[PDB]
Amino acid sequence: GTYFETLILFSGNLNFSTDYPIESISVYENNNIQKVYWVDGLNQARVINITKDDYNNADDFDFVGTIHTSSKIEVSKVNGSGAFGQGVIQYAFTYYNK
Amino acid sequence: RYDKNRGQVNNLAVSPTNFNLFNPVYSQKNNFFTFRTIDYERFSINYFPNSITVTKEKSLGEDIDTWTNITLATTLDLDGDKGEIVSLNTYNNEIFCF
Amino acid sequence: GVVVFPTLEDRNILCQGILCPTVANYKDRLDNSPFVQSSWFSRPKQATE
Numbered sequence: 001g002t003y004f005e006t007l008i009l010f011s012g013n014l015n016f017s018t019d020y021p022i023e024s025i026s027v028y029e030n031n032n033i034q035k036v037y038w039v040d041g042l043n044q045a046r047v048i049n050i051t052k053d054d055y056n057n058a059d060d061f062d063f064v065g066t067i068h069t070s071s072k073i074e075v076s077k078v079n080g081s082g083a084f085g086q087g088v089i090q091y092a093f094t095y096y097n098k
Numbered sequence: 099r100y101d102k103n104r105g106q107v108n109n110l111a112v113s114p115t116n117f118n119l120f121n122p123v124y125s126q127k128n129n130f131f132t133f134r135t136i137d138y139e140r141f142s143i144n145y146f147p148n149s150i151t152v153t154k155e156k157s158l159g160e161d162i163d164t165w166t167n168i169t170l171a172t173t174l175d176l177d178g179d180k181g182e183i184v185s186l187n188t189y190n191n192e193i194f195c196f
Numbered sequence: 197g198v199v200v201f202p203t204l205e206d207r208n209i210l211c212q213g214i215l216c217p218t219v220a221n222y223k224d225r226l227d228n229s230p231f232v233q234s235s236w237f238s239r240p241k242q243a244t245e
Binding site for chain 2: 025026027028029030031032033
Binding site for chain 1: 203204205
C-alpha cells in the first residue's frame with residue numbers, strides 16, 4: 001500500500017559491468033516458478049526464480065545446472081529376471097530440475 | 099496347455115513336440131488398470147493460468163456430451179510474460195482472448 | 197485391495213515340485229563319465245513295508 005517489500009535474492013560477484021547493462025525477459029508459469037531471464041553483452045546468459053531466496057553462489061543462475069554433491073553410482077548386472085537383447089549396454093545419468 | 103494328449107493310457111508317441119504345448123496368454127495379470135503411490139509433500143503443480151483446453155465438436159447425437167468430457171488432449175498455452183487469461187470472448191465467428 | 201507381486205529376483209520360493217531319485221551305472225560312477233544320470237522311471241517311495 002505505502003512501501004516496497006524489498007528482499008535481497010543474491011549478493012556476490014556475478015561479473016557485471018556498467019558498460020554492459022541488463023536486458024531481461026520474465027514469465028509467469030505458476031505461483032512458484034516466476035523466472036527472470038537476463039543477458040549482458042559480455043557475460044553468459046542467466047536465470048533467476050524470484051520466488052526463491054536460497055541462491056548462495058553465482059553458478060545457480062546459469063542455463064546449465066550445477067552439481068554440488070559427489071554422486072557415486074555403481075551399476076551391477078543381475079541375472080535371472082528381465083528381458084534384454086544381446087550386446088553391450090552403457091548407462092548415462094544426468095540431473096534435471098522439474 | 100492346448101494339446102489333447104492329456105489323460106490317455108497310450109502315451110506311447112508323446113514328446114515335448116506334442117505333450118506339453120503351452121499358450122502363455124492365459125498367464126496374464128490385471129496389468130491394464132495399474133496404479134502407484136504418491137507423496138503428499140511433493141510439489142506437483144495443478145495451476146495453468148496460460149492454458150486453454152478444447153473439447154470435441156458436439157455430435158448432437160445419442161451419446162455423451164463432449165463438453166463434459168475434458169481430456170486435456172488439445173491444449174493451447176498463451177504467452178506467460180503478458181499475464182493470465184483474464185477472459186475469453188467470441189465476436190463474429192472468432193475467439194479473442196483477453 | 198491393491199498389491200505389488202514379487203519379481204523372480206526377490207522371490208523367497210523359486211519353485212515347487214516333486215523330488216525324483218537318480219540312477220548311476222557301476223562302471224560309470226567309477227569313471228565319472230556319467231557318475232549320476234536321470235532315471236528312465238519315476239521312483240516313488242512307498243508308505244509301508
